[PDB]
Design a protein around this ligand. Structure first.
Ligand code: MG
Ligand code: MG
Ligand code: MG
Ligand code: MG
Ligand code: MG
Ligand code: MG
Ligand code: MG
Ligand code: MG
Lengths: 225, 226
């Protein structure tokens, strides 16, 4: 599992050939990134399955809801997104393996398929909410492709720190796994590398025990206050 | 002037009949509000003129730039807006009078013509930057029209406080004048009043001494951190 200071960076395996092209078919995110962001969203139930296997079950598609206390810019509202088309679960399995997720109860995950674009005039903001916790137990952020972009540096922060204790620009084929409770994080804006268009394609997976799931009417009611 | 708490709420005079309709012709703000905000932007020089009067001069139109230290969501970038069509300067003069602006040097103002829309599913964020200072010496926020909205409550905060010391929902025909340095502010989201569409039309005027103007290549370099 995570290495003493509550995060690990891993290399990801090769991904199925449909995954990278699917980012072209993600519709604009109407709620975050002011036109720079494109998004699909699905939710899964994670159950331990026999000899060290985890099974994934796609849940009925629902609006995304989070708390303003975790995301003041995009929280407290129903965010209507389309489902993810492709299958990120083999990639996610790598994070489950590196986290060594507690097999003693089932888990629930949010899966964000995010493209952020940058251009000469206009960086692509990755965490306009700033330094923050997502509100879950664990978070996995995986980079699937970067084209003509600089910046996009992940920074990890201890509670109350004036400066991050760790920084690193995650590249295509890398993922960071983090204790989303013990650590906060932000990420610097995506910058156009040469003045022309560029983009950064990622997946964010937020892990919560099913008993604390971010799914259903009770969660929605709480997140929307 | 403002008075000991660093803010005052004033009533505004009647406005010319072109002001309220002009809000229907503000294009979408591409940089803030995620489609809920519509905006035009102009900058003026304010000079002390004879007879205890103030002269307004509209400056050559330039992209808006502000600092990330004041606006982390919309700071540090060139924001290309279209100029304001109508003339807010009579309304601004009510603010200058109430502020008692220091006549000993000229001033420069940023003028933001803002419409925020709310709908049943979708509140209209007014200060997604959160509690903040705009970075200027004084700020005037005037409400020109509210249609079918709730929320939109202005909250004023002492530096570093964990709760605001004053709150008020400003209505059409009201303006708040504030010490943008000694106080921070935020505003609660615009809410649909009945489930249908609604909107809130305002102008924000940020006052800075000309010697510290938020205009021109040097300000831009500083705000963009170039
Ligand atoms: Mg998003
Ligand atoms: Mg944005
Ligand atoms: Mg992002
Ligand atoms: Mg969240
Ligand atoms: Mg915004
Ligand atoms: Mg601003
Ligand atoms: Mg506003
Ligand atoms: Mg500002």
């Amino acid at each position: 599992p995570l290495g003493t200071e509550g995060f690990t960076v891993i290399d990801l395996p090769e991904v199925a050939p449909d995954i990278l092209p699917s980012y072209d078919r993600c519709p604009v995110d109407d709620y975050m990134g002011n036109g720079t962001r494109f998004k699909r969203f699905s939710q899964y139930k994670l159950t331990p399955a026999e000899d060290d296997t985890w099974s994934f079950k796609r849940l009925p598609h629902r609006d995304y809801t989070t708390y303003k206390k975790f995301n003041p810019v995009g929280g407290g509202i129903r965010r209507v997104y389309e489902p993810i088309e492709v299958d990120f679960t083999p990639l996610i399995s790598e994070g489950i393996r590196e986290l060594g997720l507690d097999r003693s109860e089932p888990w629930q995950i949010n899966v964000h398929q995010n493209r952020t674009r940058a251009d000469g005039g206009r960086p692509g903001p990755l965490t306009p909410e700033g330094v923050h916790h997502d509100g879950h137990e664990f978070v996995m952020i995986a980079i699937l492709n970067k084209v003509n972009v600089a910046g996009g540096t992940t920074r990890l922060w201890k509670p109350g720190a004036d400066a991050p204790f760790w920084s690193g620009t995650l590249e295509a084929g890398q993922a960071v796994l983090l204790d989303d409770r013990g650590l906060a994080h932000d990420v610097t804006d995506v910058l156009s590398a040469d003045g022309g268009p560029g983009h950064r394609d990622i997946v964010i997976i937020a892990f919560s025990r099913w008993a604390e799931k971010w799914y259903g009417d009770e969660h929605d009611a709480a997140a929307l206050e």
